[PDB]
Amino acid sequence: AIKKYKPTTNGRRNMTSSDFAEITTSTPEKSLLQPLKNNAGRNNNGRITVRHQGGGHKRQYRVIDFKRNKDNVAAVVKTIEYDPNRSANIALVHYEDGVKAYILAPKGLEVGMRLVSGPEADIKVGNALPLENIPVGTVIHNIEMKPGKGGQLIRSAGTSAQVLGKEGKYVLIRLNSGEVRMILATCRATIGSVGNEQHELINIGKAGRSRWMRKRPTVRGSVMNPNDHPHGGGEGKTPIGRKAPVSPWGQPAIGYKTRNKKAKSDKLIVRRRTK
Amino acid sequence: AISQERKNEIIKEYARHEGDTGSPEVQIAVLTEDINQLNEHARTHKKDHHSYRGLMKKIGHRRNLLAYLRKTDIQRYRELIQRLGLRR
RNA sequence: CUCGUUAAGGAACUCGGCAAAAUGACCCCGUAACUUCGGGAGAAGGGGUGCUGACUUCGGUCAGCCGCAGUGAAUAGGCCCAAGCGACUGUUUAUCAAAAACACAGGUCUCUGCAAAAUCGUAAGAUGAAGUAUAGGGGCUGACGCCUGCCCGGUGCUGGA
RNA sequence: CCAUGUCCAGGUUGAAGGUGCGGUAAAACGCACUGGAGGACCGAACCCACGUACGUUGAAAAGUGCGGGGAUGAGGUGUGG
RNA sequence: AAACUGGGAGACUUGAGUGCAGAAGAGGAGAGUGGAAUUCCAUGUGUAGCGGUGAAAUGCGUAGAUAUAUGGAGGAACACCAGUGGCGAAGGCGGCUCUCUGGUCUGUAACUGACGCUGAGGCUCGAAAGCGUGGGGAGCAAACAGGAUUAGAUACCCUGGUAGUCCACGCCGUAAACGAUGAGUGCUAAGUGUUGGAGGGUUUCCGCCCUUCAGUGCUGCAGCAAACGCAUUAAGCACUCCGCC
């Protein structure tokens, strides 16, 4: 649930947080962590290519199985854990050979289930199958877009897609955001929707907590000088003395579309709905 | 709500002589079983306002019979309310 | 120039109580409007404080003594009633401007189906991200409370054929 | 901005949760004890630079004296980049 | 002094509850599901109108409307059954299946033995509109725009159209919330319909006659009323307690 703080300081008045009640341990598996660095938005060359990033808390990377390739061997669920790198929770899983792995935690996963990962698997939450073998109207997450590469699509906290129909060598899916699309019928996905979903309702509360997450502050274009922004300059507060407010590099900012007009995937997109 | 075998099961142990379905012991014990089960059902279905009426009327009936038993024999009253587990 | 004292008056001084003077420790009693119920609050306003003896249930209390003065030196909040601006802690013109300016948590519009959009670069290669729409970029507004009218002729943007 | 170290005398306050008692049909709830949150409070080192007097061929190419603000954080700062 | 009211020791079964055997029902909460129609979409055929009114106009249409045929998408309400019928303390409740659950009626005569009635203050529930957070959104429709009508028309009429009307969770606490008729109990002519039961006869009575409980309507006497009227479902004759003028 969402936890509400009492207003004991001015920096506390309207903050909320997670209860962390689906999490069952706080000590990760040692053989599945690697280091990370916090690039802070800088390049190959040492230059800022993305503004407003840098300098929070240190993190170790957990390796996830986005492929789901170990078939005809059940895996038991041992823990539901905290990941610093994503917004979903994560599950430690014991295969019977004794391989260990991490997995994205779907909605309603209990410690103790036994998941299966092939074409003859059942339709239960957690199970992963090729899209050919999934009926019409099942809620789905963690979708491959190329055979054998790993799920890419429905991965963040509380998201889901749905199966609409089949044809020759393609399956129709309605994704999160409402776009309709085609995906190869030999790709995989796992049954369920992603888990921790109150995540959306958290109120950060003060300027220090979003500094703990690795975000640096943002200055508005219109309190700059005319050599920094197209919006800078003028005596006093000023309006947008232009048509169409723009980015620091020109490029209009309300309603102007920026995807590639000769995209090699415009064959597969039915019914653009939201971007 | 209790079945008709639970009911006879619990009126065969608060009877006094044989053939003893009256006797405010029997009635408050059976009413206690009912009120417990209905409290469960209410916790599950908490916007069933039309069954809560019956719950409340059972509670009134039990409290009335308790008052009667007390005003006429305090020994039976104390022994009961110990045996049945109430009087908070 | 830096220090100490000053009769009677006590802001009559000056752009302005500037600068000085005054409050300052511990223990006890008490303490308003308003309020987001946490505060306001050290609100305000008052009292005690040394030394000897006796008892000390324990922590203290009684009897006595001395000085103008007992936290006897040094160190340590002045307070109150009203109005504007910014919610708040924070940041800023190294060296004439610390603020009503910037930021901020919260709001809203829009772009982006992943070799994502965006940015560095001739390119190779990179950040974004070992992320995947509850995510990432851009513009405006700026806690919280109540609210946010009319206009699509013009100009941009989107769709059309 | 990145990697790896290190620093913050002393004192105050009393959030969530927990345990016991009462109030109930079960409860909202009430009171003690516990507990130790926070861009919380007071105040040295440390980091700052609000007022004023002096200095202005200076003790000093930006300071000193007497007062001021922050002092567990959006903190200070050493070494290699 | 000891009839009555109060107190104490007993005893009883008619009030009140329980057991046993049966009956009816849009009573409530949750989860799925069906067909008819309106709207939009897709595709074929198809030529100049359609729509609307007391008459007109605005609107849609030769970027091929309306019509017509087949397929999809979504939402909301449930035709016939349907009835002065049923259920609920009231507000209210109508497609179908399952799960959880409250109350009523009838017969019996195992049981308890007055355990009853009413109820200031207090709690619970309470149509529609409205408010908050997050969804959904087909039809209808405050506000609003355009067309008419009139002396004028910030209306009635026509073409559009936003909140809302729908779901989950909180708040609000009011209506001609009405039978403008507080609750309990006993007593006082008859006649006639219908809903759910129980007994006796004739008995294929399971379709008929008689009796008897509990609901729901119509007519009508004593009595009551200022008249209207009410009348075993009292506004009649009486006792208890509350609310109010």
Coordinates of C-alpha atoms (C1' of nucleotides) in Angstrom, one line a residue, chain A residues 7 10 13 39 41-45 47 49 51 53 61 86 145 149 152-153 155-158 175-177 179 181 197 199-200 203-205 207 210 217-223 229 231 244-249 251 253 255-259 265 275, chain C residues 35-39 86-90 100-107 109-121 123-145 154-159:
Chain A
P7 CA 3.3 16.8 8.7
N10 CA 7.6 21.5 6.2
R13 CA 3.7 17.6 4.6
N39 CA 27.7 7.9 -16.6
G41 CA 24.9 11.9 -19.2
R42 CA 28.4 12.1 -20.7
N43 CA 29.7 10.7 -23.9
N44 CA 32.5 8.7 -25.5
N45 CA 34.1 12.2 -25.9
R47 CA 30.5 15.7 -23.3
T49 CA 24.6 14.6 -24.6
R51 CA 20.9 17.2 -19.7
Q53 CA 21.3 13.6 -15.1
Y61 CA 23.4 -4.4 -11.6
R86 CA 13.9 -0.7 -12.8
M145 CA 10.6 -8.7 -31.1
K149 CA 17.0 -11.9 -28.4
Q152 CA 11.8 -5.8 -25.0
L153 CA 8.2 -4.4 -24.9
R155 CA 8.5 -4.3 -18.9
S156 CA 7.6 -1.5 -16.5
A157 CA 5.6 -1.6 -13.3
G158 CA 1.9 -2.4 -13.9
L175 CA 0.3 -2.7 -26.6
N176 CA 0.4 -0.4 -23.7
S177 CA -0.4 3.2 -25.0
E179 CA -1.0 1.1 -30.5
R181 CA 0.9 -3.9 -34.2
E197 CA 1.5 -1.0 -9.7
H199 CA 4.2 2.8 -8.0
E200 CA 2.4 5.5 -10.0
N203 CA 4.5 11.7 -4.2
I204 CA 8.2 12.5 -3.9
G205 CA 7.7 15.4 -1.5
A207 CA 13.8 18.3 -3.7
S210 CA 14.7 13.3 -6.4
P217 CA 17.7 20.4 -11.7
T218 CA 16.2 22.1 -14.8
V219 CA 16.2 25.8 -15.7
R220 CA 13.4 27.2 -17.9
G221 CA 14.3 28.5 -21.3
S222 CA 12.8 31.9 -20.7
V223 CA 15.0 33.1 -17.8
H229 CA 18.0 29.8 -25.7
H231 CA 13.3 32.1 -25.3
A244 CA 5.5 27.7 -31.7
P245 CA 7.7 27.5 -28.6
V246 CA 11.0 25.6 -29.4
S247 CA 13.7 23.5 -27.8
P248 CA 17.2 24.9 -27.1
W249 CA 18.1 23.7 -30.6
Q251 CA 12.6 22.3 -33.2
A253 CA 7.6 21.7 -28.9
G255 CA 2.4 18.9 -31.5
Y256 CA 5.2 18.6 -34.0
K257 CA 6.0 15.0 -35.0
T258 CA 9.5 13.5 -35.1
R259 CA 9.5 9.9 -36.3
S265 CA 8.3 -0.8 -39.9
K275 CA 2.5 9.0 -29.3
Chain C
rU35 C1' -4.1 26.7 12.4
rU36 C1' -2.6 22.6 7.0
rC37 C1' -3.9 19.9 14.2
rG38 C1' 2.3 19.2 13.6
rG39 C1' 2.4 24.0 15.4
rG86 C1' 8.0 34.5 -2.1
rA87 C1' 4.9 28.1 0.5
rC88 C1' 9.0 26.0 2.9
rU89 C1' 15.3 23.9 3.7
rG90 C1' 18.4 25.4 -0.5
rA100 C1' 10.3 39.9 -4.5
rA101 C1' 15.6 36.8 -8.8
rC102 C1' 17.0 30.9 -9.8
rA103 C1' 15.6 26.0 -8.0
rC104 C1' 11.9 23.0 -5.8
rA105 C1' 7.9 18.9 -4.5
rG106 C1' 2.9 19.3 -7.3
rG107 C1' 0.0 20.7 -12.2
rC109 C1' 0.4 20.2 -23.0
rU110 C1' 3.2 17.6 -26.5
rC111 C1' 7.0 14.0 -28.8
rU112 C1' 8.8 8.7 -28.6
rG113 C1' 6.9 1.0 -30.4
rC114 C1' 13.0 0.5 -29.5
rA115 C1' 18.7 0.4 -34.5
rA116 C1' 12.9 5.1 -29.8
rA117 C1' 12.7 10.2 -30.0
rA118 C1' 17.0 13.7 -28.5
rU119 C1' 22.3 15.0 -28.3
rC120 C1' 28.1 14.6 -29.5
rG121 C1' 30.7 13.3 -34.3
rA123 C1' 32.1 8.7 -40.4
rA124 C1' 33.2 4.6 -37.3
rG125 C1' 31.6 4.9 -32.3
rA126 C1' 28.9 6.6 -28.2
rU127 C1' 25.4 8.8 -24.2
rG128 C1' 20.0 7.9 -23.7
rA129 C1' 20.2 2.5 -21.2
rA130 C1' 22.9 -2.9 -19.8
rG131 C1' 16.3 1.5 -19.7
rU132 C1' 11.1 -0.3 -22.9
rA133 C1' 5.2 4.1 -22.5
rU134 C1' 3.7 3.6 -14.3
rA135 C1' 9.7 4.7 -19.4
rG136 C1' 12.7 8.5 -21.7
rG137 C1' 13.1 13.9 -24.2
rG138 C1' 11.1 19.1 -24.8
rG139 C1' 7.8 23.9 -23.5
rC140 C1' 5.1 26.6 -19.8
rU141 C1' 3.2 27.1 -14.6
rG142 C1' 5.3 26.6 -9.5
rA143 C1' 3.4 23.7 -1.6
rC144 C1' -1.5 23.5 -0.2
rG145 C1' -7.2 25.5 -0.6
rG154 C1' -5.3 35.8 -38.7
rU155 C1' -0.4 32.9 -37.7
rG156 C1' 1.8 28.0 -36.4
rC157 C1' 0.7 22.8 -35.8
rU158 C1' -2.0 18.3 -37.3
rG159 C1' -5.3 15.6 -41.0

